[PDB]
Amino acid sequence: TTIVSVRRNGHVVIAGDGQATLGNTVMKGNVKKVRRLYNDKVIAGFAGGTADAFTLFELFERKLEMHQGHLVKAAVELAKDWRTDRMLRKLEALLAVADETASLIITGNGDVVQPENDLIAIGSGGPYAQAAARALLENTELSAREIAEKALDIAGDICIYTNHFHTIEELSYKAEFHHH
Amino acid sequence: TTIVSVRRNGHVVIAGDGQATLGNTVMKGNVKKVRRLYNDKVIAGFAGGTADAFTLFELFERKLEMHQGHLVKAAVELAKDWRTDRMLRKLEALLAVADETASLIITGNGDVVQPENDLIAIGSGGPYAQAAARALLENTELSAREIAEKALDIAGDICIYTNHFHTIEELSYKAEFHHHH
Amino acid sequence: TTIVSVRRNGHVVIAGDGQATLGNTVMKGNVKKVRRLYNDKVIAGFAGGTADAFTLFELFERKLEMHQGHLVKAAVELAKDWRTDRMLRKLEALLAVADETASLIITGNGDVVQPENDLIAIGSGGPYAQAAARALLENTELSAREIAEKALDIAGDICIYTNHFHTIEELSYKAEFHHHH
Amino acid sequence: TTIVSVRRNGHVVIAGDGQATLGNTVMKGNVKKVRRLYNDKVIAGFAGGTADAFTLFELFERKLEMHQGHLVKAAVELAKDWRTDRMLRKLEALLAVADETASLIITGNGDVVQPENDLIAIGSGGPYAQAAARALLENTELSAREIAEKALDIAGDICIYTNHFHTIEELSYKAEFHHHH
Amino acid sequence: TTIVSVRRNGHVVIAGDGQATLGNTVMKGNVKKVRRLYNDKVIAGFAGGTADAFTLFELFERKLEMHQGHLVKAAVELAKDWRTDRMLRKLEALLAVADETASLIITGNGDVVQPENDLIAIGSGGPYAQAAARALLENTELSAREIAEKALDIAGDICIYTNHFHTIEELSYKAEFHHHH
Amino acid sequence: TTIVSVRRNGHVVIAGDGQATLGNTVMKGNVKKVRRLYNDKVIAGFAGGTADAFTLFELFERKLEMHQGHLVKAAVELAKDWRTDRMLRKLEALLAVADETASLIITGNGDVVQPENDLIAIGSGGPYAQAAARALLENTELSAREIAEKALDIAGDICIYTNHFHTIEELSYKAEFHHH
Amino acid sequence: TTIVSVRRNGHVVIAGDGQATLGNTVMKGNVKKVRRLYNDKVIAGFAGGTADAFTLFELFERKLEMHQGHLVKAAVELAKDWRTDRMLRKLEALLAVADETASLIITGNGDVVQPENDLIAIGSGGPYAQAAARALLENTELSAREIAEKALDIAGDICIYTNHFHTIEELSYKAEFHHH
Amino acid sequence: TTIVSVRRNGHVVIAGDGQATLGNTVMKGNVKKVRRLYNDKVIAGFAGGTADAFTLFELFERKLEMHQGHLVKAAVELAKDWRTDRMLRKLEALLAVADETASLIITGNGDVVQPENDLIAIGSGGPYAQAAARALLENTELSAREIAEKALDIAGDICIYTNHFHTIEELSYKAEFHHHH
Amino acid sequence: TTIVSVRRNGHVVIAGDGQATLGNTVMKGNVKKVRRLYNDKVIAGFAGGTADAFTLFELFERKLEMHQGHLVKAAVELAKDWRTDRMLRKLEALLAVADETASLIITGNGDVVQPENDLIAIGSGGPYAQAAARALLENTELSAREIAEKALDIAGDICIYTNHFHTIEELSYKAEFHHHH
Amino acid sequence: TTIVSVRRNGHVVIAGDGQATLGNTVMKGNVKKVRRLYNDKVIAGFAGGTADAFTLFELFERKLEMHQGHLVKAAVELAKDWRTDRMLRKLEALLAVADETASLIITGNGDVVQPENDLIAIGSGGPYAQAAARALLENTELSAREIAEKALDIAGDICIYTNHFHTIEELSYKAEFHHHH
Amino acid sequence: TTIVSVRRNGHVVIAGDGQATLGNTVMKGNVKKVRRLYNDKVIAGFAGGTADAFTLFELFERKLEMHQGHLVKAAVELAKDWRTDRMLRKLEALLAVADETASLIITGNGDVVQPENDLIAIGSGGPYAQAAARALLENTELSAREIAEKALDIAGDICIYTNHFHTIEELSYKAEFHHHH
């Protein structure tokens, strides 16, 4: 499992593979690890098992409406409850979330984090992709999209636990407004 | 324990062995791991111990009537409660369910899944069978039945934890065919 | 790493992938795990690291000329020395060898084995491929080649440790197949 | 600890040893592991510690009267509560129960099971006795009694954790055997 | 892997299954674990891997001719060298040997043993079979053959590591009988 | 720690040492491991730590009055609660209890047991003492007292974890009643 | 496995059971663990596996003739080589040896020991038997034989790993010499 | 992660790095581990994960207003609740807090501590920095600031888990320093 | 951490070091582990972390006033609540307490103990000190003070976890003496 | 096992207990752990098993005559060979040796050491005795003898692994003590 | 155990503590870990046990004369033989060596190293001292001596395994200075 995010110009993206590895056998390989929340305003990607993710995303989206649209806080409030009540302390995963606002990793442990460049790379191959992505983003242009794609690809070429099937979600936000 | 499912033309099947392995001794070897729910409309197979299964199947079938016959949903609602209340969080198993609608694995963990081809292979030998099955389904015709049977056989030939005694349930619903000449 | 062998009509084949997995990172993925010995008369496939293999293949090929072309014996003599002198007792791998004569797995442990059908399936994915292969070979024709290929493919689709890059070697030993287009 | 059950003609029996092993020292060796419930209509044997057993037997016998005399159900209802509420989830043991109705293993895990022949063999030596018993029951007649006894004896001869002191309970439910001296 | 031996009237037998289990996958299941030595005078069964066995059987048979036909001795001398020189100290297995003379287990460890009744039961299932066998041999007649067969069957029914495919070798030498009337 | 019990003629005894071993250092060596309950009618010995013991003995003595003087049951009821509620499931020890009625080991695990001869031998050296005791009781007379003493002595001579300081409690019950 | 030795008046004895326990299954139960060396002059008992024992007994008996009949030294020289050359360092067991001279435990580790009373108790049940034996030997007479027997019996009654089948060897040495 | 504090003349400082190490990969490296509470009167630094910290800082700042401005007490009351209710017993971290009043380490374990010199050195590198810091503070003057900086730098040069990105907060509470150029 | 107590003539003392060891680094080394309660009538020493200690001392001192001045009792009542309510069951430490009445160790586990000579030696070095102390107290006179000091010194000389900085509290109450001539 | 040494005026002593502890059972308790070498000129004590000791003492005494009577060197040369050739590298123990010359601990590891005061305290209880001994030697006179005895006694009172049976060897090397009754 | 080295102006120093820690008890605490070789021209410090050190120092000093006075080389040649012949491969330690030439750590592993500033800090506390030392050397002047002393002090203040008793050896060789005014 591997997921990335990038922010270039007016585009932020989250992209993950879909390999359902188990033990040493792929049980499935097209899981949508990336999806969107709060009516197409905020994107996210989770690492782990669909359930916990869903429970979290919901709860998080709850904390979302419960704070209007302040991503940061919604996330924060969530991370709290998560690394709080004994129950949630059981569900484990990692959530990459982003929107016009910003991007942030949320771990079950209790850690809400804005990476060093809205460059979220997580999962088994996170490091690998990160590197690639980074490299690109550093020594080249291309789009958030292209890069993520690119890196997220390479990831799986190295980390066995990664798929190659790309679920992606990107939202542009160039507030181009022509008065006539 | 191993269980498969397939869907070819107008036939979907679920087939499992019956080996009651314990530690390293077979206590029994004719357990019906596959059965049918909601008055012969939906089939299922569970992996694990009869009890939990029964508790789940019932609860699931409750969530079933409680949504008419929308398999997906019923399953979804179930997986919820399962990977929800601390109590159910104790019963562990895997449920392979199918019908005209579709087929889906339901884990206790909280995971409702449509495999990559309504090809459900679970249990110790799941991977093995899957392979065989797949292979067949790929490079040959035959029936959902034949295939499942075939694979589910091979499974036990390799995975010690698998039986060879085949409990099967298949439901047809729009029997197709594809003959050439 | 996964390697298969099959024997159908006048064709015996050995085919393996090429994934150089390490820890949880692929360092390379095009290793030729399958090759031929004794001047294109005997084929083999090894599971593990190039070196040990080479050491073994050579020593084995030595025990080969040292017994003319009696595959069985060459293999037997080898497995002995292997699971014998302290030194060799360190190099570990698995050797799938075949020719007109037959096919046999050679383990470092000290085991020379003719599988249940000259159907050699070894490696992380061995079981998987075996299954598929088997299934094919059972419920269909096709060639030793097609099957191995097919299975060895499927293998990697399931076992992460398997590559998909196919190194194959097949030797025919009778026939004169024709083609009418 | 080892316990068996058999059903031959009109006789079902449960027999266990009495070795109170602990660590690697026998603290006692005459524990009655087999007993009867519901006013001499149903027999049972437990594997483990007197307490949990008693707690279970009682609760089970409660679920018993609470369903008249339908052994199966009583057992089922019990296994549920057992592999249900956190509390019971702690008491661990195995219950071999039988009567005119049938015989069934009840595990704390959540598993109510009718063995392959009303041949219940449980405990450290269970497998061993099962074997012997089985063998007898297969290639000979004798009584449920004789067999159980026999097997349950042999058990201890092999499994150190087994006693040799036989607590047995058998209930007949038809017949009128005679004797001409 | 499981192997038995029995001696009734004028017949001593050695019988073993043929399951080539590895890890948790059967690589083969028709290995001849039982065979005969010294020109059809002495039988044996080995537990483990064909190679080591062969090395031992040969060496043992060497120690055999080297002592005429005194099984005991040959065996003794063998066990010596086996649990002696560092090299042999690596090959591990168990040898069940018998003939007119007697029957004896030979372990690599250095142990030549006459079981408690020329009833050799070894291998994963050894204990199981033993039991059954014993039981038979105790509470019934039948032949060394029938018994062994019977037991060796049951074995695999319980011990997953056992095959069911029976390789047997029995030698008669003063065929008795005991009929009553 | 080691404790024994014996029953000969009209005398039942419980005797234990007093070694407070810890790690590999004796912190104390005169702990009274044996004592009496229910107003000098029932004796007992515990193995382990004074606290848990006290909690148990009390609770047990509670279950005692709560059943008049039926040792067996009191014990049984106790063993239940002990190997029952999560809380008690934490306190661990072994209780040797006896009286006119009988003698019985009660473990936390959930096990109430009448040994093979009202010969209770428990603790690190239990086995050892048992043996000796047994031997005596088998091939000689002497008193319950003498034997226990004897054995309980030997125990410590072998098991390092045993003390040699003997706390003993014996109750006779020969209902000798002269009518005049 | 359990073996004892005793020395009373002019009789020294070694006695062991014969249980061939393995894992948790008795493979055999009549192994002769006790035997005699150097032409019926010295007795011994081994704990473990027949082979190693034989190798040792032989080597030891070699070191025996190689020192005339000085048990002690023979034993000592042996224990050396045993807990010496890498090879022997692999064979593990315990040897109880005795004769007119004395009695002594020899471990592979490198330890030749005369117990506290020519009372050798070794093996799984050694401690147990020891106790019993001791007890007897302490508070009663009877013979070395009777006691060993007795104790060695009790042993198996407690230690599951012990058999009950008694192989015994006792040598008397009362140099009663009547001049006529 | 590493954090220091010093008190020299009228200046107390808290400074930490910003390395977000995980496993053996830096996920981020600019985390503000040091911050200020109770309206710029009290400073603090936490070791660990942002969340728990925040939960604690808040609760502590609650216990702060709830005792006016008596740092010591606020801290004490906090450490209590922390190493008290089961819930808080889960959040783990270390809090370095200081102000005009004093400086004190607060551990989840239940320990409120004033170091040996208002010289708080905590975190993976704490010991290292402490040393350096100490050494400076001992054999030289410079400012609390310069020292912390200096040491906290050196820290990362040695402890891989330390960043080098310095988040610092210093509060003076007397003086009027001048400068003649 | 190490603490001692002694009682000679009319003087009882409690003395402990002050090493704040953590992992393998001293974070502080002047912690007052010994202090006095109930208005200079009762002394005590705790082993562990200041917090828990304080919680206990207070609660204990509460149980103190709540029983006038009967040390024993107060202690007993305390040990109860301590090794009682789940909450307190978390705070762990050891309390050495003494006064005119007597001296007693109180563990969280639930254990109130009068050592073998009002000679309380606890903590990492407890055993060591005890020894020395004992030795002195045995083969010499000197004062409770001197001895404690002496021993408590030696302790740190051996046990790395011990400080050398001595916090002591001694209360006289009927000052004896024993001079000869 | 515990052994001490002291040097006071013209007397150096080595004293050890005799507890043959094994696992958790004393197999013997009168082993002479202390003895004398080189014709009553040098004393020593070993910690461990009689054999290795003897091997060492001999070899050391060889290195002794091989250097006349220079204890230090003999010891040094020994420790070398000991922590040198693979073989000796297996025998493990500790040797306390002394004479007119001096006293020194010799470990198998490769360490020849003169303690801080010719006060050798080794063995499980070494630390304990050391303490006591020390304390005596510090705050009192008495003889090397009395002290060792005293301490070595106390040792066993605390360390279970220590005996109480005292084997002692003391050599004087000046003086002419008198006694007026 | 901790040892440092520094080089300032015309002075290079090596300084180590003297704590003989064992398990968790100091057996001695005045071991001279630092000493000089090749007739007062080269200094060194070893970490570990006196023996091995001595063996090495000698052998190294042999390799020293055997190359005149080229420290580097001598060291190199030594490290070779050390991390070479199986025998030396057993003695383990660390050698800090210096002289006019330079300073270098020599590990048994096979590693001759010039630290980043002739600032050798090794041993348990090595890191700690290094830090301090470094800090000094960085933000202050003072002498190689003062610094080492200072740091090597601090070390033991933190690392329990360090002594405080300072054995030092410094050699001047072109005494510089740098005064300003």
State the first-to-last Cα distance of chain E, in angstroms, to the nearest integer.
42
Closest to F93 (Cα-Cα) out of F61, F59, F56, F119: F56
> Quick check: is H21 catalytic?
no
Which residues does B85 contact at the CB level (< 8 Å), separation at least 6?
A: none
Optimal mutation site among H2, H4, H139, interface K, most CBs of chain K within 10 A: H139
| SS3 state of residue E95 | strand
| SS3 state of residue J171 | strand
What burial class does residue J117 get, using C-beta atoms within 10 Å of its C-beta: 0-12 exposed, 13-18 middle, 19+ buried? middle
What residues in C contact E25, CB-CB < 8 Å? Answer: 126-127
Q: Determine the Cα–Cα distance for residues D76 and D60; give it in Å rounded to an integer.
A: 9
Residue of H nearest to A78 (CA): H51
Residue from the list D129, D140, D155 with its beta carbon closest to the beta carbon of E139: D140
What residues in E contact C76, CB-CB < 8 Å? Answer: 51
Optimal mutation site among G50, G52, G58, G90, interface E, most CBs of chain E within 10 A: G50
What residues in I contact H113, CB-CB < 8 Å? Answer: 20, 27-28, 50
Q: Determine the Cα–Cα distance for residues E133 and E115; give it in Å rounded to an integer.
A: 13
The DSSP bridge partners found for residue E98 are: E43, E103
Optimal mutation site among I5, I77, I94, I113, interface F, most CBs of chain F within 10 A: I113
Helix (H) or strand (E) holding G4: strand G2-8
Closest to H118 (Cα-Cα) out of H30, H9, H39: H9
Closest to H148 (Cα-Cα) out of H179, H117, H174, H178: H117
Binding positions of H for Na(+) are 156, 159, 162
Q: Using only C-alpha atoms, what is the Rg of chain I?
A: 16
Closest to F95 (Cα-Cα) out of F59, F70, F143: F59
Provide the 10 A C-beta neighbour count for residue F143.
15
What residues in C contact E30, CB-CB < 8 Å? Answer: 116
Q: Determine the Cα–Cα distance for residues K2 and K47; give it in Å rounded to an integer.
A: 7
Q: Please identify which of the residues E1, E2, E101, E167 carries the catalytic annotation.
A: E1
Helix (H) or strand (E) holding E76: helix E71-82
What residues in I contact H47, CB-CB < 8 Å? Answer: none
Residue from the list G83, G116, G126 with its beta carbon closest to the beta carbon of J52: G83
What residues in C contact B133, CB-CB < 8 Å? Answer: 135
Yes or no, beta carbons of B135 and C127 under 8 Å apart:
no
Tell me the torsion sign for CA atoms E80, E83, E87, E93: positive
Chains D+B touching (3+ CB pairs under 8 Å): yes
Q: Please identify which of the residues H1, H2, H101, H167 carries the catalytic annotation.
A: H1
Q: Determine the Cα–Cα distance for residues J23 and J44; give it in Å rounded to an integer.
A: 26
Provide the 10 A C-beta neighbour count for residue G97.
28
**b/e map of E21-51 (b: 16 or more CB within 10 Å)?**
beeebbbbbebebbbebbeeebbbbbbbbbb
Distances (CA, A) of H152 to F10, H2, H116: 79, 7, 18
Q: Using only C-alpha atoms, what is the Rg of chain F?
A: 16
The encoded tokens of residue B121 equal 């292979």
Superfamily of domain A1-180 in CATH is Aminohydrolase, N-terminal nucleophile (Ntn) domain (3.60.20.10)
The encoded tokens of residue F150 equal 């004897």
Helix (H) or strand (E) holding A118: none
Specify whether the CB–CB gap between J53 and J97 falls below 8 A.
Answer: no
The encoded tokens of residue G14 equal 């070694």
What burial class does residue B92 get, using C-beta atoms within 10 Å of its C-beta: 0-12 exposed, 13-18 middle, 19+ buried? middle
Q: Which amino acid is at F10?
A: G
Residue from the list E127, E136, E154 with its beta carbon closest to the beta carbon of D158: E127
Q: Which amino acid is at B76?
A: V
Closest to E43 (Cα-Cα) out of E100, E110, E124: E100
Region class of F9: left (phi > 0), else alpha (psi between -120 and 50), else beta: left
Closest to A96 (Cα-Cα) out of A140, A135, A133, A142: A133
Min CA distance, E62 vs chain D (Å)? 36
The encoded tokens of residue J79 equal 């420790």
DSSP for E139-164 reads: H----HHHHHHHHHHHHHHHBTT---
Yes or no, beta carbons of B91 and D105 under 8 Å apart:
no
Q: Using only C-alpha atoms, what is the Rg of chain B?
A: 16
Tell me the torsion sign for CA atoms E154, E159, E165, E170: negative
DSSP for D78-125 reads: HHHHHTTSTTGGG---EEEEESSS-EEEEETTTEEE--SSS--EEETT
Q: Using only C-alpha atoms, what is the Rg of chain C?
A: 16
Note the helical H segments in H93-142. Answer: 126-139
Helix (H) or strand (E) holding B36: strand B34-37
Q: Determine the Cα–Cα distance for residues D21 and D160; give it in Å rounded to an integer.
A: 9
What burial class does residue J179 get, using C-beta atoms within 10 Å of its C-beta: 0-12 exposed, 13-18 middle, 19+ buried? exposed
Tell me the domain boundaries of chain F: 1-180
| SS3 state of residue H18 | coil
Residue from the list D25, D30, D51 with its beta carbon closest to the beta carbon of F80: D51
Residue of I nearest to J134 (CA): I132
Neighbours of chain I (3+ CB pairs under 8 A): F, H, J, K
Yes or no, beta carbons of A113 and H30 under 8 Å apart:
no
Specify whether the CB–CB gap between B36 and B29 falls below 8 A.
Answer: no
- Alpha-carbon K155 to chain mean position: 15
Specify whether the CB–CB gap between K153 and H134 falls below 8 A.
Answer: no
Region class of B162: left (phi > 0), else alpha (psi between -120 and 50), else beta: beta
Chains B, D: CB pairs < 8 Å? 34
Note the helical H segments in chain H. Answer: 50-65, 71-82, 126-139, 144-158
Yes or no, beta carbons of D160 and G158 under 8 Å apart:
no
CA angle C96, C101, C104 (to 5 degrees): 25
Region class of A9: left (phi > 0), else alpha (psi between -120 and 50), else beta: left
Closest to H91 (Cα-Cα) out of A89, I119, C148, E173: A89
What burial class does residue F68 get, using C-beta atoms within 10 Å of its C-beta: 0-12 exposed, 13-18 middle, 19+ buried? exposed
Provide the 10 A C-beta neighbour count for residue D176.
6
Sheet holding G11-16, edge to edge: G121-123, G2-8, G11-16, G167-172
Min CA distance, D110 vs chain B (Å)? 6
What burial class does residue K97 get, using C-beta atoms within 10 Å of its C-beta: 0-12 exposed, 13-18 middle, 19+ buried? buried
Closest to D60 (Cα-Cα) out of D39, D38, D40: D38
Residue of E nearest to C85 (CA): E87
Instruction: State the DSSP code for K32.
Output: -
The encoded tokens of residue E38 equal 């010294």
Chains I, K: CB pairs < 8 Å? 23
DSSP for J80-124 reads: HHHTTSTTGGG---EEEEESSS-EEEEETTTEEE--SSS--EEET
The answer to whether J159 is annotated as binding is: yes
Q: Determine the Cα–Cα distance for residues D164 and D150; give it in Å rounded to an integer.
A: 10
- Which CATH code is given to the segment(s) J1-181? 3.60.20.10
The encoded tokens of residue A94 equal 């990692």
Distances (CA, A) of G95 to A125, G82, G88, G119, K154: 59, 12, 14, 13, 56
Instruction: State the DSSP code for A159.
Output: B
Q: Determine the Cα–Cα distance for residues A51 and A57; give it in Å rounded to an integer.
A: 10
Give me the phi and psi of J33, to 5 degrees please: -85, -20
- Alpha-carbon D107 to chain mean position: 12
Min CA distance, D99 vs chain E (Å)? 26
The encoded tokens of residue K54 equal 């001595």
Instruction: State the DSSP code for K99.
Output: S
Which residues does J125 contact at the CB level (< 8 Å), separation at least 6?
A: J1, J2, J17, J155, J156, J158, J159, J161, J162
Tell me the torsion sign for CA atoms A157, A161, A166, A172: negative
Specify whether the CB–CB gap between B175 and B15 falls below 8 A.
Answer: no
- Residue entry with tokens 């029914």: E157
Can you state the angle between helices B144-158 and B126-139, rounded to 10 degrees?
Answer: 140
Q: Determine the Cα–Cα distance for residues G109 and C133; give it in Å rounded to an integer.
A: 55
Note the helical H segments in chain G. Answer: 50-65, 71-82, 126-139, 144-158
Give me the phi and psi of E161, to 5 degrees please: -70, 0
Optimal mutation site among F1, F25, F28, F124, interface J, most CBs of chain J within 10 A: F25
Distances (CA, A) of E72 to E42, E68, E119, G52: 11, 11, 16, 19
Q: HSE-up of J96 (CA within 13 Å, CB side)?
A: 28
- Alpha-carbon E152 to chain mean position: 11
Closest to H162 (Cα-Cα) out of K127, K154, A83: K127
The encoded tokens of residue K171 equal 């050699």
Closest to G70 (Cα-Cα) out of G42, G109, G112: G42
Helix (H) or strand (E) holding G106: strand G103-107
Helix (H) or strand (E) holding C80: helix C71-82
Tell me the torsion sign for CA atoms F73, F78, F84, F89: negative
Distances (CA, A) of C36 to C29, C63, D88, E35, I70: 20, 15, 63, 35, 93
Give me the phi and psi of J47, to 5 degrees please: -120, 125
Q: Determine the Cα–Cα distance for residues A72 and A101; give it in Å rounded to an integer.
A: 8
Closest to J86 (Cα-Cα) out of K58, G85, K83: G85
Specify whether the CB–CB gap between K129 and K136 falls below 8 A.
Answer: no
| SS3 state of residue G64 | helix
Region class of A48: left (phi > 0), else alpha (psi between -120 and 50), else beta: left
Q: Please identify which of the residues A1, A2, A101, A167 carries the catalytic annotation.
A: A1
DSSP for chain F reads: -EEEEEEETTEEEEEE--EEEETTEEEEE----EEEEGGGTEEEEEES-HHHHHHHHHHHHHHHHTTTT-HHHHHHHHHHHHTTSTTGGG---EEEEESSS-EEEEETTTEEE--TTS--EEETTHHHHHHHHHHHHHH----HHHHHHHHHHHHHHHBTT-----EEEEEE--------
Q: Determine the Cα–Cα distance for residues I135 and D107; give it in Å rounded to an integer.
A: 59
The answer to whether E159 is annotated as binding is: yes
Closest to F54 (Cα-Cα) out of F33, F70, F72: F33
Q: Determine the Cα–Cα distance for residues B59 and B38; give it in Å rounded to an integer.
A: 12
Q: Determine the Cα–Cα distance for residues E114 and G31; give it in Å rounded to an integer.
A: 10
Specify whether the CB–CB gap between F140 and G141 falls below 8 A.
Answer: no
Give me the phi and psi of F32, to 5 degrees please: -85, 100
State the first-to-last Cα distance of chain D, in angstroms, to the nearest integer.
38
Specify whether the CB–CB gap between G37 and G71 falls below 8 A.
Answer: no
How many Å is the maximal CA-CA distance in chain J? 59
Specify whether the CB–CB gap between I111 and I80 falls below 8 A.
Answer: no
What burial class does residue A66 get, using C-beta atoms within 10 Å of its C-beta: 0-12 exposed, 13-18 middle, 19+ buried? exposed
Closest to F79 (Cα-Cα) out of F109, F116, F45, F54: F109
Which residues does G51 contact at the CB level (< 8 Å), separation at least 6?
A: E79, E83, E109, E110, E111, G91
Q: Determine the Cα–Cα distance for residues K18 and B78; give it in Å rounded to an integer.
A: 69
Q: Determine the Cα–Cα distance for residues A94 and D139; give it in Å rounded to an integer.
A: 62
Q: Determine the Cα–Cα distance for residues E163 and E152; give it in Å rounded to an integer.
A: 9
Which residues does K130 contact at the CB level (< 8 Å), separation at least 6?
A: H158, K4, K119, K121, K151
Specify whether the CB–CB gap between C125 and C156 falls below 8 A.
Answer: yes
Yes or no, beta carbons of C158 and B127 under 8 Å apart:
yes
Resolution in A, one decimal? 3.8
Q: HSE-up of C174 (CA within 13 Å, CB side)?
A: 8
Residue of B nearest to C121 (CA): B158
Specify whether the CB–CB gap between E150 and E18 falls below 8 A.
Answer: no
Min CA distance, A177 vs chain H (Å)? 35
Neighbours of chain E (3+ CB pairs under 8 A): B, C, D, G
Which residues does I146 contact at the CB level (< 8 Å), separation at least 6?
A: I136, J139
